[PDB]
Each structure stands twice: as structure tokens, then as C-alpha cells.
Amino acid sequence: PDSYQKILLAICEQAAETNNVYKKHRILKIYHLFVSLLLKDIKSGLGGAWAFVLRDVIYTLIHYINQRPSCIMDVSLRSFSLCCDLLSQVCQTAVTYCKDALENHLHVIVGTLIPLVYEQVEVQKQVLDLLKYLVID
């Protein structure tokens, strides 16, 4: 069960050690692929480590969203959109397969998502869609 923690820690270290926008975008794409693969095997669970992996992923995405340059480039916009899509997919999978998964993390997610609406239209649309799924739906 600790293998998932080791891989997540390694990806976090590789993301943090570099500062290039292209390398960061590539690492975020690899992280998105790994998270999607992990969610593709949610029927049987990750050996009892689903809660910790879910918390680590959502907190990593929240931290990535919180820190960002004031000027958004094309690669930065693509990375932000990929992070938002990954967060939305994670939230949908967790809600669908675990009713009480978000009972301890909904507040921080909403608190992070509220300031995001004051941004470019496309990411505003994604943030509103995620908020509607989390609350209205």
C-alpha cells in the first residue's frame, strides 16, 4: 500500500525540484495520467489506502491552484485547465463511489474554488461547473 505513497512523493519531488513551465506542465500531465489510472481501479479499492491517496491528491491540487503567477501564459493556462479537470474528475469519482468521502474536505475545496471565479472565462466556467456538481447536483 505504501507504493502509491512512494510514487506520489516522487512525482511531488520532481515537480518541486524544477521551475521550468514546460517541465512543470509535463509533470502535471504525468500526474493526471497516474491519477486517472488510479481512479480506473477504484472498484476494489487501493488496499485500504484510498482515503490517504484521495487526501494527498486533493491537497496537492489545492496547493497547485493556490500558487500561480499573476500573468497567465498559454502553457500556464493549459496547466491550470488540466489541474481543474483532474480535480473535477477526482471529486466526481469520489462522490459517486464514496458518499462520505467529501464530508471532511468539501469546505477547503469550496474555499479554494470561490476566488477562482474572478479569472478568465474558460476556467470560470469549469469552476462554476464543479461548484454546481458539488452543491446543486
Q: Provide DSSP, 43-98.
A: SS-STT-HHHHHHHHHHHHHHHHHS--SS--HHHHHHHHHHHHHHHHHHHHHHHH-
Pull the grid cell for residue 24.
Answer: 512543470
Comparing C-alpha atoms, which of 64, 72, 42, 66 is closest to residue 54?
42
Q: What is the resolution of this structure in A?
A: 2.5
CA angle 58, 61, 67 (to 5 degrees): 140
Between CA 100 and CA 95 the distance in angstroms is 8
Question: What was the elucidation method?
Answer: cryo-EM
Which among 120, 55, 39, 127 is positioned nearest to 85, based on CA atoms?
127
Written as nine digits, the cell of 127 is: 469552476
Note whether 85 and 126 are within 8 A (CB). Answer: yes
To which residue does cell 466526481 refer?
A: 92
Per-residue cell: 111: 474555499
Whether residue 80 contacts residue 116, with contact meaning beta carbons closer than 8 Å, is answered with no
